[PDB]
Amino acid sequence: TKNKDGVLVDEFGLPQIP
Amino acid sequence: TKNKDGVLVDEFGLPQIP
Amino acid sequence: THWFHRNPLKATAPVSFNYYGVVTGPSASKICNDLRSSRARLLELFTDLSCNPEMMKNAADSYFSLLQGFINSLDESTQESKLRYIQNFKWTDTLQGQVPSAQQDAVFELISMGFNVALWYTKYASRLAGKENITEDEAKEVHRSLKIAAGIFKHLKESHLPKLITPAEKGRDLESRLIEAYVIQCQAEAQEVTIARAIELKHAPGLIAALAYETANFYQKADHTLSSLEPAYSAKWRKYLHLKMCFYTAYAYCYHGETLLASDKCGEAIRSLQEAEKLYAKAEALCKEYGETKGPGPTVKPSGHLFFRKLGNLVKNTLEKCQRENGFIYFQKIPTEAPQLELKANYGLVEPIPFEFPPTSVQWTPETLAAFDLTKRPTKPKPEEEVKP
Amino acid sequence: THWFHRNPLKATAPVSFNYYGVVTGPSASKICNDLRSSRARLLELFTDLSCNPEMMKNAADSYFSLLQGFINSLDESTQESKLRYIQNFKWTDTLQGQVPSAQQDAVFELISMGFNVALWYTKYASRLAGKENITEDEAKEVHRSLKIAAGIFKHLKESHLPKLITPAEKGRDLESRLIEAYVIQCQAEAQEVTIARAIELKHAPGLIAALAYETANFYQKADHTLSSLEPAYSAKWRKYLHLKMCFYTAYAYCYHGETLLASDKCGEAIRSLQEAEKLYAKAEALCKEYGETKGPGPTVKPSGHLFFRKLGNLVKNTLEKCQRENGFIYFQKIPTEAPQLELKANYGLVEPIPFEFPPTSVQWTPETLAAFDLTKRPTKPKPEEEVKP
């Protein structure tokens, strides 16, 4: 999902990247 | 040459080795 | 791995729900047998190490929805049931040892049962977080459980305690100061897990610094909160969260260090990395005699230090571009007192999973209620002990 | 490279050696022309940057062996020549600036001429040690020259000054305290070269530590020695050997460090390496305002620091086996005051090359001496300035 600011987010609330 | 203790010595008074 | 301190579960005397001339009829007579068996099913689960949260959710749903009948009524959500003051429940306290506390209120029984379930959730997370074999998926559980627990505690505190008749005594779990500390502790503990993850996946040093910093603030807050209780019982606990805020602040300075070096600022990249290791030193000073300090709950031996394996690289890397500056090995000029940190973290913060009790059981109908005739009412067992491990 | 402080050469008025009715005959008349031209040949050499020591040895041999006739006699080595007090020589001083000092003694002229040659030897070593192109062979010269110089100074001090009539004045080169400092300085300077070599050929760290330590003791001693003179003239010099003993003590702790680590002793491997770099810091603090402090001689800008390129490895290597101990980056427990060093060095110590003047010239025969008739003895030029560079 995304957070309030519009950022793709880990289930843990963290940012998501490689 | 050698020094008092009998050791092969550099012209600089130092020990001599490779 | 992960290590969390755990105060003991609450214990309670058997409640039979047996009223004699007062219960007339099959439906009312049934519901007292359901309250009896369902409360007991919920109680055996606590002691039981075989129980997953979906089992737990169920067992609790059952009871609490049957319990509701004694508190509020199915007709008006605003008006209260005639049964609220009928039964007297005897519960012990996490910090109070073996000493029971009793009230004839169904709110007391509910707030206390629920409290035990929220406590349960954390214990499940805690036992599950001890293993070395932790799976990405099993972390989502430990983490989720902590939020389910922080949520329950929150609910009990501000939606429920207000309803109690007698005020709660200082040092009892049903005191809102003591609950406030649990909510926070839970939130903090979750974030520990997040940190553990963020580190493992190589997220940005600024992130892990801020997340670890805000986490130290939590044990700060829960130390201040708890601070109002006589040191006899809160002693060991207070030392452990005093210890934890300290262990996680080390992470702050450490991981903040990499945010300075990389920023090309040396003296405060050092004074900080020093500060981190000064603190990790004091942190273990605190572990050691928290182990000495007596209080409720088992002593958890702190496990993971990759802290060094992290500091190590930073130290190496730092001296590399700073070799020409403050050190090597004799440092000047390096600032006397440590660099202030006010950092907010935008990622990994925990919001308690909002909780609500299940609505009153459909088994409660006006007929089922009128079949308890209080007009016909005319020795005690003792609290069955927990015996944890 | 190498950097040594150099006080200015001594200057002297022309001495013609012209006596009129006093010199009767060809041989005596010849010898005064040889003393005249030979002293002047020796003097032009000082100012001259084209002169190698084998040229110098010769020019000096010539003069001093002709000069001897005025001091002692060819018949009895114990009895003194009638000419010793005949001529009056006017010499300036290294520390005294432009102010001449005069004596009618041939011993004064000899001690002072010789002093200038010993001074010369060092200057030759010094100029030769400035280049970056230094050859193993050219070092043997710089080194040998310093010992030839330390030898001459020694000789003058304890074999010759005693013979002077008037006592020597404080702050004049012909004072035995001032000479004692030169001998030592010379010995020290040589050893610097040896160190520079020992380092380059990778000799044992224990060696270079002890050699560098004993060298710092030398500038210690020459600071104490010189310490008895009014600060006006000795100011800059004293700061430079104060500076040097300090720069070489850094080497001591540094190179001693590698003798602890390798010995598996950490806290004092650190406290020392720190001490080394604490000192190398102060050493440059001293260079800077030695440059400010006014005194005779040019200011030599200190060149080589591989010191860091050395400390660097030690620092790196030290933190490697000590990472689990005192540091990293926050050090405890590291001893408050610095570890005492008393070390003697068995290799590279300098003994002054024993010096002696050449015996009196064969040109002096009783007839050549009797041909100076003192019975027939009945305005001044001024000291021709040095103008060094």
UniProtKB/Swiss-Prot annotation, chains A, B:
Post-translational modification: (Microbial infection) Stearoylated By S.flexneri N-epsilon-fatty acyltransferase IcsB, promoting S.flexneri evasion of autophagy. ISGylated. Isgylation inhibits its interaction with VTA1.
Localization per Swiss-Prot or TrEMBL: Cytoplasm, Cytosol; Endosome membrane; Midbody
Upregulation: Up-regulated by muramyl-dipeptide and lipopolysaccharide.
Function text: Probable peripherally associated component of the endosomal sorting required for transport complex III (ESCRT-III) which is involved in multivesicular bodies (MVBs) formation and sorting of endosomal cargo proteins into MVBs. MVBs contain intraluminal vesicles (ILVs) that are generated by invagination and scission from the limiting membrane of the endosome and mostly are delivered to lysosomes enabling degradation of membrane proteins, such as stimulated growth factor receptors, lysosomal enzymes and lipids.
Subunit text: Probable peripherally associated component of the endosomal sorting required for transport complex III (ESCRT-III). ESCRT-III components are thought to multimerize to form a flat lattice on the perimeter membrane of the endosome. Several assembly forms of ESCRT-III may exist that interact and act sequentially. Interacts with VTA1; the interaction involves soluble CHMP5. Interacts with CHMP2A. Interacts with NOD2. Interacts with BROX.
Protein family: Belongs to the SNF7 family.
Entry protein name: Charged multivesicular body protein 5
Record gene name: CHMP5
From Swiss-Prot, chains C, D:
Residue ranges the record marks as coiled coil: none
Post-translational modification: Farnesylation is required for nuclear envelope localization.
GO (cellular component) term, any one: extracellular exosome
Modified residues (N6-acetyllysine): 282
Domain of life per record: Eukaryota
Gene3D superfamilies according to UniProt: alix/aip1 like domains (1.25.40.280)
Protein's membrane topology: Lipid-anchor
GO terms classed as biological process: mitotic nuclear membrane reassembly
Start and end residues of each BRO1 domain: 89-389
InterPro entries: BRO1_dom, BRO1_sf, BROX
Pfam families membership: BRO1
Keyword terms, alphabetized: Acetylation, Lipoprotein, Membrane, Methylation, Nucleus, Prenylation
Cellular localisation: Nucleus membrane
Job of this protein: Nuclear envelope-associated factor that is involved in the nuclear envelope ruptures during interphase (NERDI) repair, where it is locally recruited by CHMP5 and reduces cytoskeletal stress through its action on SYN2 to help reseal the ruptured membrane.
Family (UniProt): Belongs to the BROX family.
Subunit and interaction comment: Monomer. Interacts with CHMP4B. Interacts with CHMP5: this interaction allows the recruitment of BROX to cellular membranes. Interacts with SYN2; this interaction promotes SYN2 ubiquitination and facilitates the relaxation of mechanical stress imposed by compressive actin fibers at the rupture site.
Annotated protein name in UniProt: BRO1 domain-containing protein BROX
Source organism (scientific name): Homo sapiens
